[PDB]
Amino acid sequence: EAVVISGRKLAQQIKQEVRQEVEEWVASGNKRPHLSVILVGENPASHSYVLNKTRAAAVVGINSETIMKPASISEEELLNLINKLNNDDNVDGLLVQLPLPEHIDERRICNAVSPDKDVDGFHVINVGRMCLDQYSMLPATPWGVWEIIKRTGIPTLGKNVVVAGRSKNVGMPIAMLLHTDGAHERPGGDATVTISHRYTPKEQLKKHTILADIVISAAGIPNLITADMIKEGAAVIDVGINRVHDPVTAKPKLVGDVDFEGVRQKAGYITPVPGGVGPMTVAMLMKNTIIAAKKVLR
Amino acid sequence: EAVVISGRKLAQQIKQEVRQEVEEWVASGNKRPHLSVILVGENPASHSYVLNKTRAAAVVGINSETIMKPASISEEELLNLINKLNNDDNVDGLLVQLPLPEHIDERRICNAVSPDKDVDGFHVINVGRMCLDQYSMLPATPWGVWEIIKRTGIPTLGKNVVVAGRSKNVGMPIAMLLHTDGAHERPGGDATVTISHRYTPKEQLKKHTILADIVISAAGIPNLITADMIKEGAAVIDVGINRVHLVGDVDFEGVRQKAGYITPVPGGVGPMTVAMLMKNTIIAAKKVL
Ligand SMILES: Nc1nc(=O)c(CC(=O)Nc2cnc(C(=O)N[C@@H](CCC(=O)O)C(=O)O)c(F)c2)c(N)[nH]1
Ligand SMILES: Nc1nc(=O)c(CC(=O)Nc2cnc(C(=O)N[C@@H](CCC(=O)O)C(=O)O)c(F)c2)c(N)[nH]1
Ligand SMILES: Nc1ncnc2c1ncn2[C@@H]1O[C@H](COP(=O)(O)OP(=O)(O)O)[C@@H](O)[C@H]1O
Question: Cβ distance A87 to A79 under 8 Å?
């Protein structure tokens, strides 16, 4: 039966580390780090998630604010705000919670944020640098997945890894980190990586996961991954956060992409949803904010 | 036996497309495109390849010059030259042939070329845009591999593909093009892609290639792919160009029984590399950023 990795405990340890580091930075008489978060509209998940981020900033010694804007705001208005904050020498990190409404182009917004305040790592320069194995602001969810693997001592060099999902801020950067050279400026995990997506036929997915020492599911599909697909002792990391309705009572429940109960038999490791990858995302963003405050990637 | 794909012939087709496009463009008022190539040192592969590029330029009606410099050139000189060429409005495309001498930072050189004139697609912005499936200057070898697959009619959507190698200008971009979404601004092939490299155990490689409708080898290792690694009827694309006693990364002679399609070396991907660069030069001349 599978060791269950608590991403909540790990995230909490990492927050303690950022706390000490912020205490230190300030005791040396530096400006306290400041994170600004922009939230557009009323997606409830977006609200909960931004709540989690600002709390985390509070508890690790980072000053936060959330600027909430109505969904009817124009792209131009959002850009004027971004520009104010890029020019405010008090703001170390600046993030815009996603998704944005359809009249606003996310890519133009992500590229408007100053690369050295880009704690999400979504600016095209950060994406380019990451894809070239250079130092960059790494994106929080993928770096969280990496820390779960690395801090649990699960090896990656030479190993087979499958990532279900190819989204530009989750699946793609996860696949990039895991396959790349450990000897490079930004080290990778030297694994053999397969990437699947919405057109991977389910039988062919299974044919690749069955060979996998590590399966990382970032598709947003309940019960995508089941124990017949996993091999004995493999690590299984679950990036999905899927809001379902619970058969016994149609209560609103969070599952991931893995059939936890089925897979926790056969697997060597497993993360739960909730309390797995999600809090790690919040922890790695605290890390990026301290990094941005210390202006080390200038 | 396997259908042997002629890169020589597909490249001919592409170069005729560019010739026509260039001729309409000049005919309708515009400056004739110009490609400037910077060559440093005496690597015989580099010299041969830069000659192939400028010949192709000449025959599709694109003006060229190669600027040859000694290996001894300093990084500051090379950047000075690049800066001059970035400002010369006669120059549409600018490329610096690799590899550069060990005392020159390649990445610094690559980022110094104006993105508008970056016909190799090695500038960090071009790499970033490509990884986001945005319009970009696609790198020549990866776009060549893509054109080989799509002009030969080999399907990719839902299919299994293995790329052997993860170099930033070949193997990584090939994997990026093949797995990405056909509906995006810069379409991809909607395939299921495995990337392998110098730490993939050979048996594990084989366990992936066995499943593969397409195997693309960009490792630079003679005989890495052998017919027991292929599944019958599969497309094998050989990006390797190795000096031994020129051959690929495939055992051509063996794999051609088992394979559905196969590319030779020479005459496969290499001539396509040259062709796609001509494509990129006319795209740069037209200033469709
Ligand atoms: N600019 C930008 N950047 C981004 O990074 C992201 C991604 C992101 O914020 N992800 C998450 C994920 N999970 C949590 C979390 O708290 N998860 C808990 C459950 C809490 C509950 O159910 O409400 C868990 O999974 O246990 C979080 F705070 C943030 C977006 N959308 N936008
Ligand atoms: N900035 C930059 N950009 C780059 O794109 C490249 C890569 C590159 O130039 N690739 C190639 C590959 N092959 C050929 C070729 O003509 N191959 C013939 C064999 C001819 C013979 O040497 O006898 C074949 O394979 O049939 C070519 F002209 C260029 C580099 N290095 N640098
Ligand atoms: N056994 C192997 N299987 C797959 N890829 C390999 C193997 N051995 C080496 N490689 C890869 O080949 C590449 C060598 O780089 P390079 O020669 O610069 O690229 P190219 O083949 O495009 O010229 C590296 O990415 C390396 O990890």
Answer: no
Give resolution in angstroms.
2.2
Query: DSSP strand E in chain B: where?
Result: 3-4, 34-40, 63-69, 93-96, 160-164, 192-196, 214-217, 235-238, 261-262
B186 Cα to chain A: minimum distance (Å) = 14
Residues 6+ apart with CB under 8 A from B27: none
Q: Tokens standing for B289? A: 């950023």
* Residues whose CB is less than 8 angstroms from the CB of residue B189 and which lie 6 or more positions away in sequence, other chains included: B146, B149, B156, B157, B161, B177, B178, B179, B180, B182
| Structure obtained using | X-ray
Q: What is the DSSP string of A179-191?
A: HS-TTSSS-----
SS3 content of chain B, % helix, strand, coil (to 5): 40, 15, 45
Tokens linked to A16: 């303690």
Half-sphere exposure of A269 (CA within 13 A, CB side): 23
| B200 with A192: Cβ contact below 8 A | yes
Enumerate residues lining ligand 2, CB below 6 A.
Answer: B 48-49, 52-53, 95-98, 120, 140-141, 241, 265-267, 270-271, 273-274
**CA of B123: which chain A residue's CA is closest?**
A128
Mutation target among A200, A206, A211, A213 for the B interface, most CBs of B within 10 A: A200
Using alpha carbons, select from B67, B65, B66, B56 the residue that is nearest to residue B22. Answer: B56
> Distance between CA A73 and CA A75 in Å, rounded?
7
The residue whose CA has the least distance to atom 19 of ligand 3 is B167
Q: Could you give the C-alpha distances from B92 to A208, B10, B62, B82, B97, in angstroms and in order?
A: 45, 25, 10, 13, 16
B254's CB contacts (< 8 A; 6+ apart) are B226, B227
CB B18 within 8 A of CB B282: yes
Which residue has its alpha carbon closest to ligand 2 atom 22?
B48
